[PDB]
Design a protein around this nucleic acid. Structure first.
Ligand SMILES: O=P(O)(O)O[C@H]1[C@H](OP(=O)(O)O)[C@@H](OP(=O)(O)O)[C@H](OP(=O)(O)O)[C@@H](OP(=O)(O)O)[C@H]1OP(=O)(O)O
Lengths: 492, 530
DNA sequence: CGATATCTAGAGGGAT
DNA sequence: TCCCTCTAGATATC
């Protein structure tokens, strides 16, 4: 199945006011956020359906010919042309074009807006999993002068929720503050704060558009009897360049590929039972597939608790593979969440990590992992920076660790350490987990964008991972010369 | 290149003395030797292995002239190990009825090393002695033994039925033989091997004396055999006017089975008989075969299919300058959480070999980072063809060396922002006081560390990072069983593997009552619907 | 200068 | 049905 997202942007007269601020207007804010969502969906090759609808405009375009409702894009997979059409409205000139070809400041009623959204949701003939509407507006009481309109909007939100779609609102900065409890409390399905920066709104959108897909629903066995069900999630997953797809030369549709194995003499197709697995050591071993799988089997899939180990015994430099996240799954075993919460609370209090034997699936050797207790922390915008649960840290075996050649430990004089301290303090900078982009992926998708739109020259990506050599050289001043004088010999 | 290893095993009469409920020292030594030879054979190492048995009924060594060094047999000379050696170890070798001096056996092993290594080149010469030290021995040859060991550059290791430092489980964690339960002859032998190992290398000699059960769950047999990794030369650059010559090694790297399973015919057992190929057809209905010359690769950009030739892709792909280890900036160590570590390796960065100035500069940087509790965010590229990475280089200071540890950090596209419901602010899943007390008792009882010796030192009761990967030993056992007994089914997993993969029995005994309390306090019912 | 390592490309189990 | 892991095979580079 597929899940679809509809972006609902307010085109009211108050969305184009910068409020005497150097930052972008909320309309440009929403446009750029939707663009970033489209780009992120394309990068991850997501199968999402996305739509953009503007309300409060003069011109209208929809199936039911409702006034002041315009559907820029219907529910469809993102593409280069859609991103270009969205870019047409970006910036000050984009806002101007939006006013010329679109209209603004007209009256509207929310009931028709959600009716159009529901009609768009029902228009697509696909396996619809979850339907979501994100409403971008800085107006907290759209129908404060019309009680009937407010009641109709509330009824439409109610029966649309009963239909089975989600309706989350992303309020933007408004002078005097935004009050959710005023009119929008009874419509949406604690809550985030107002949006004042572009990446703030981007993070707030991505916190809701993305859906959690559990890597595996395993069982955490305290012993043979006490068993609870947990879900494993990968909070970090290394993004990969999408594999190429073979196409027909003239028609360019994808071609199906399948592998067929036969005997080089007879040529007939052979069953898997007609072959075995072999290894040759020196001048010598025949095994079946079942035996090759069985020799890899130690335990049933799940997590088996060995004991609790203090957190100071987990070395930071013993990293083996990217960690996973463990969260309770009340769907499978009733009462798992209570035991999970008690274990998390007590592990956080005692600063200990649960040591378990980890078996992802059947016929795989076990691995020792540490369930490091991790506590939920929020941002000033009530964004969940760190989810509550256990972090599954893989512990290396003795084979994974490698011995290394030794050298005499040469220590540095305190003056050299002081010069290096000055150099380090000069180049201090704040690090965030999303401070850098992948140059390879950025360049690859820039080339894909250029080819899709038939642009002659692709846009050259700016490498943020390259050090600011000139800026850092200017910042360091002459400290490097002093450090070289104190460390390096005159001849080197 | 390679190394020469001589295994000196005791097959004396007293080595078969089995205390009821515990395997005899002969069987444990056989298991350790079997594991060593299995790893050396199935990893296809070029190391040379020789086997010397002392305590046999017969006598076969190039020193028997003059009724000397009796009851010592050189079972196998220095050659590449093969399945014949494994078959001999498993079945052919039988315990003897005589007693032999273990120092005389050491002399015989040293003579084997000195004579059979002529011509061939060996970086390391290693001798491992398996004995119980429960036999009368002479001390007249001790000084020349030490002199020959030192001057010939020969390493030494000792394996005993009892560790040096309830029920006994082979390969377990914690149980050991009673030190007061050994004989006076065993005590004298222990003193002599202690003095020998002090002379050979020093205080680490005690660290290089192991027990059979302890060695079954460690890679200590291969410790003097492992080949060092290759350094990755580069320069650590801070800006454009500061550069430090460095060498990087892979401290952590997951081990995988090098050999691959070959698909062969079930009748002729030949790979060439079977042949696989790919044929391309249209994905729509009425599928027709598509020739290779009509196939051109392309890429998916959203809903649009973009043709993209390989030559074009290589022309306008991202191009990097090449080798680089460049500091982007320094951030507080608290801003880099270990849950964001990415990649499949850990690099330890040292200064360039035989470079005093580089060592001083890197030491200055490491100490500055440690004192200010900061870390370095660096850009790392293995070569001109590798994708550049962003990682963290944090200091790592030991009493014998200092280095920077590099672990790759994620990009923006690698992060996934999932929303999880809070557990503290839940009225349905809030544990009561009794449940919290029960979990506290369980955590206290199931502790895997103790504050022994009252010296504020934390002892690890289950140091899993020293346990070898069980998959390699299990696979080697299965392969050897198939090679020696082709018609028999695969054997079950050895008991010592399970013993080494399980926590000590004291933890399980302590966890009995708290687990029952947890079971009676936390109701757990599986769901039948949805 | 060639052996090591990295990017890349095919099957299989499991959540959806 | 697709994602992630595992396992083979290729190969430009130091
Ligand atoms: O048990 P741990 O606390 O993790 O100690 C380990 C262990 O050494 P010791 O137990 O002798 O101290 C490593 O060697 P193995 O015994 O596992 O083979 C050793 O490895 P290296 O010194 O070769 O690197 C490592 O050192 P490091 O922290 O540098 O990785 C060291 O850690 P600590 O000395 O910090 O305890």
């Amino acid at each position: 199945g597929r899940d679809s997202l509809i972006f609902l942007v307010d085109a009211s007269k108050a969305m184009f006011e910068s409020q005497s601020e150097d930052e972008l207007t909320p309309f440009d804010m929403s446009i750029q956020c939707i663009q970033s969502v489209y780009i992120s969906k394309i990068i991850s090759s997501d199968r999402d359906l996305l739509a953009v609808v503007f309300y409060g405009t003069e011109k209208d375009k929809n199936s039911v010919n409702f006034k002041n409702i315009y559907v820029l894009q219907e529910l469809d997979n993102p593409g280069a042309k859609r991103i270009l059409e969205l870019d047409q409205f970006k910036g000050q000139q984009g806002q101007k074009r939006f006013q010329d070809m679109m209209g603004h400041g007209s009256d509207y009623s929310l009931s028709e807006v959600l009716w159009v959204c529901a009609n768009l949701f029902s228009d697509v003939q696909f396996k619809m999993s979850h339907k979501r509407i994100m409403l971008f507006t800085n107006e907290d009481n759209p129908h404060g002068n019309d009680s009937a309109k407010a009641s109709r909007a509330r009824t439409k939100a109610g029966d649309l929720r009963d239909t089975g779609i989600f309706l989350d609102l992303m309020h933007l900065k408004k002078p005097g503050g935004f009050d959710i409890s005023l009119f929008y409390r009874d419509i949406i399905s604690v809550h985030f704060e107002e949006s004042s920066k572009l990446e703030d709104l981007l993070r707030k959108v991505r916190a809701k558009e993305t859906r959690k897909r559990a890597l595996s629903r395993l069982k955490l066995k305290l012993n043979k009897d006490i068993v609870i069900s947990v879900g494993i999630y990968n909070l970090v997953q290394k993004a990969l360049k999408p594999p190429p797809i073979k196409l027909y030369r003239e028609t360019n549709e994808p071609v199906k590929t399948k592998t067929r194995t036969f005997n080089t003499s007879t040529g007939g197709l052979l069953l898997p039972s007609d072959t075995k697995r072999s290894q040759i050591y020196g001048s010598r071993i025949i095994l079946e597939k079942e035996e090759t799988e069985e020799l890899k089997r130690f335990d049933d899939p799940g997590l088996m608790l060995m004991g609790f180990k203090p957190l100071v015994l987990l070395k930071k430099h013993h990293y083996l593979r990217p960690s996973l996240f463990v969260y309770p799954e009340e769907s499978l075993v009733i009462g798992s969440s209570t035991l999970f919460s008690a274990l998390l609370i007590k592990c956080l209090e005692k600063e200990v990590a649960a040591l378990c034997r980890y078996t992802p699936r059947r016929n795989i050797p076990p691995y020792f992992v540490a369930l490091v207790p991790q506590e939920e922390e929020l941002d000033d915008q009530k964004i969940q920076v760190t989810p509550p649960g256990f972090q599954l840290v893989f512990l290396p075996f003795a084979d994974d660790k490698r011995k290394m050649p030794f050298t005499e430990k040469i220590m540095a004089t305190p003056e050299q350490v002081g010069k290096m301290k000055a150099i380090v303090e000069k180049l201090r900078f704040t690090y965030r987990s999303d401070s850098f982009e992948n140059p390879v992926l950025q360049q690859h998708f820039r080339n894909l964008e250029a080819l899709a739109l038939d642009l002659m020259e692709p846009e050259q990506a700016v490498d943020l991972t390259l050090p600011k050599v000139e800026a850092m050289n200017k910042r360091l001043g002459s400290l490097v010369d002093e450090f070289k004088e104190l460390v390096y010999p005159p001849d080197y | 290149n390679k190394a020469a290893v001589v295994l000196c095993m005791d097959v004396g009469f007293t080595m078969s003395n089995s205390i009821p409920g515990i395997e005899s020292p002969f069987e444990q030594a056989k298991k350790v030797i079997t594991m060593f030879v299995q790893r050396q054979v199935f990893a296809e190492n070029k190391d040379e292995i020789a086997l010397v048995l002392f305590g046999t009924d017969g006598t076969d060594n190039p020193l028997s002239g003059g009724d000397q060094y009796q009851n010592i047999t050189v079972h196998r000379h220095l050659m590449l190990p093969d399945f014949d050696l494994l078959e001999d170890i498993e079945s052919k070798i039988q315990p003897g009825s005589q007693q032999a001096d273990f120092l005389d056996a050491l002399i015989v092993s040293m003579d084997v090393i000195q004579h059979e290594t002529i011509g061939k080149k060996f970086e390391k010469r290693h001798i491992e002695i398996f004995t119980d030290l429960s036999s009368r021995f002479s001390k007249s040859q001790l000084d020349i033994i030490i002199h020959s060991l030192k001057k010939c550059d020969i390493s030494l290791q000792f394996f005993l039925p009892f560790s040096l430092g309830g029920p006994f489980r082979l390969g377990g964690h914690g149980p050991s033989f009673p030190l007061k339960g050994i004989t006076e002859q065993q005590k004298e032998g222990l003193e002599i091997v202690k003095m020998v190992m002090i002379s050979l290398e020093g205080e680490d000699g005690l660290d290089e004396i192991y027990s059979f059960s302890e060695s079954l769950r460690k890679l200590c047999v291969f410790k003097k055999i492992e080949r060092h990794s290759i350094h990755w030369p580069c320069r650590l650059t801070i800006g454009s006017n500061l550069s430090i010559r460095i060498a990087a090694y892979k401290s952590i790297l997951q081990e995988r089975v090098k050999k691959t399973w070959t698909v062969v015919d079930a009748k002729t057992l030949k790979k060439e008989d079977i042949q696989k190929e790919t044929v391309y057809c249209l994905n729509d209905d009425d599928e027709t075969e598509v020739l290779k010359e009509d196939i051109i690769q392309g890429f998916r950009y959203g809903s649009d299919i973009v043709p993209f030739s390989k030559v074009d892709e290589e022309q306008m792909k991202y191009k990097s300058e090449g080798k680089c280890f460049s500091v982007l900036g320094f951030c507080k160590s608290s801003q880099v959480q270990r849950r964001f570590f990415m990649g499949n390796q850990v690099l330890k960065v040292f200064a360039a070999r035989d470079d005093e100035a580089a060592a001083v500069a890197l030491s200055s940087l490491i100490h500055a980072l440690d004192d200010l509790d900061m870390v370095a965010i660096v850009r790392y590229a293995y070569d001109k063809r590798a994708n550049p990475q962003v990682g963290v280089a944090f200091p790592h200071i030991k009493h014998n060396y200092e280095c920077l540890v590099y672990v790759q950090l994620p990009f923006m596209e690698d992060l996934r922002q999932y929303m999880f419901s809070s557990l503290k602010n839940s009225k349905k899943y809030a544990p009561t006081e009794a449940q919290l007390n029960a979990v506290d008792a369980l955590i206290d009882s199931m502790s895997l560390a103790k504050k022994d010796e009252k010296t504020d030192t934390l002892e690890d009761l289950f140091p899993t990072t020293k346990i070898p990967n069980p998959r390699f030993q299990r696979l080697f056992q299965c392969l050897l069983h198939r090679a020696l007994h082709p018609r028999e089914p695969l054997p079950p997993i050895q008991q010592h593997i399970w013993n080494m993969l399980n926590p000590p029995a004291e933890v399980t005994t302590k966890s009995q009552i708290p687990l029952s309390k947890i079971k009676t306090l936390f109701p757990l019912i599986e769901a039948k619907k949805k």
